[PDB]
């Protein structure tokens, strides 16, 4: 029942940017906090960013701090990552999810997506 | 920032043996450890959360323990479909970190 | 503090919640000094 | 223990009493003196704080 979807991935340029959105359907989207995940190619798993599920606080992974932006929109069940200054190191397949976090999110399931891939060169 | 570390980087073992994977942390994340399994071209599915307790649809081979800094996931008899890689999240503060991941494969 | 509000009142309708306005007066305020995260909801079952 | 020990090997009862007073709610507080109410005058006063 429960779905996540990726999409708006591509190649860009280094400096440029690029907007993900994530489509969630199947569940009470505007009742959880979200995160995004990214995984280079070779790589493993690390976290971007945080949105509580009213949209106000917002928190960023260090290496993305003062690039990337997250927001939500709960009347269209759609989170969205804007990224800018992207560089060659942010090559990366980005998931929307919610991660199952019984001190912050307060979410009891964890969701995952497809995941979208963002290459900068 | 909390440090995650894993080990081993990879371990290879056949059909019934026991398979453990220890997860570090550089500072006290309590109980705070979610463990996750991913195979290739999947995105991560949670098996234990909040140290050692098992998710609903996970096999009863699968367990986990472990208290502050030193965490270890175990797997009572690996299955060939349990070749996967596996990685520990903490999730005391923010921001969030994973481990490097243990890679489990068939010996 | 855990904060409880509650009022009851008599409905008519089914399969929604009433047009209209009512307040909610406190009804308990609780020193316990946890942390709340979750909630779930307790059902009575009968044996039979 | 006899009780015909001498006085510092005769047993006696010790009870501690420890303050805990940490970031939180308390919970344990001593009792609050109330004086008479008095009406129709101008006064000093204190309602529960
Ligand atoms: C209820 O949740 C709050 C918020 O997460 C918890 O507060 C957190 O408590 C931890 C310690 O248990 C604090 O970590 C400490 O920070 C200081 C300063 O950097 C550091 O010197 C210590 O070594 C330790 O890392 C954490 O900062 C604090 N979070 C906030 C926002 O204040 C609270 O403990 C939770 N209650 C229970 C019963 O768990």
């Known amino acids: 029942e429960v779905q996540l979807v990726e999409s708006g991935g591509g190649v860009v340029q280094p400096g440029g940017s690029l907007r993900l959105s994530c489509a969630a359907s199947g569940f009470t989207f505007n009742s959880y906090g979200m995160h995004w995940v990214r995984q280079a190619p070779g790589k493993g798993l690390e976290w971007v960013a945080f949105?509580?599920?009213?949209?106000?606080?917002?928190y960023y992974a260090d290496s993305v701090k003062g690039r990337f932006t997250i927001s939500r929109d709960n009347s269209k069940n759609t989170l969205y990552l804007q990224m800018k200054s992207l560089r060659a190191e942010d090559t990366a397949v980005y998931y929307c999810?919610?991660?199952?976090?019984?001190?912050?999110?307060?979410?009891?399931?964890?969701?995952w997506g497809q995941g979208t891939l963002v290459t900068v060169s | 920032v909390i440090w995650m570390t894993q080990s081993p980087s990879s371990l290879s073992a056949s059909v019934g043996d026991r398979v453990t994977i220890t997860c570090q942390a550089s500072q006290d994340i309590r109980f705070y450890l979610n463990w996750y399994q991913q195979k290739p071209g999947k995105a991560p599915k949670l098996l234990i959360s909040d140290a050692s307790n098992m998710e609903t649809g996970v096999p009863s081979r699968f367990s986990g323990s472990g208290s502050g800094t030193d965490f270890t996931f175990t797997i009572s008899s690996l299955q060939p479909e349990d070749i996967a890689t596996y990685y520990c999240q903490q999730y005391d503060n923010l921001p969030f970190t994973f481990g490097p991941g243990t890679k489990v494969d068939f010996k | 503090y855990f904060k409880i509000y509650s009022k009851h009142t008599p409905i008519n309708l089914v399969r929604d919640l009433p047009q209209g306005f009512s307040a909610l007066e406190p009804l308990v305020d609780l020193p316990i000094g946890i942390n709340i995260t979750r909630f779930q909801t307790l059902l009575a079952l009968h044996r039979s | 223990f006899q009780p015909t020990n001498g006085v510092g090997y005769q047993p006696y009862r010790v009870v501690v009493l420890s303050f805990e007073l940490l970031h939180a709610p308390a919970t344990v507080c001593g009792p609050k003196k109330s004086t008479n109410l008095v009406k129709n005058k101008c006064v000093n006063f204190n309602f529960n704080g």
């Open positions: 949105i509580r599920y009213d949209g106000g606080n917002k």
């Open positions: 999810a919610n991660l199952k976090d019984s001190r912050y999110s307060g979410s009891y399931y964890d969701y």
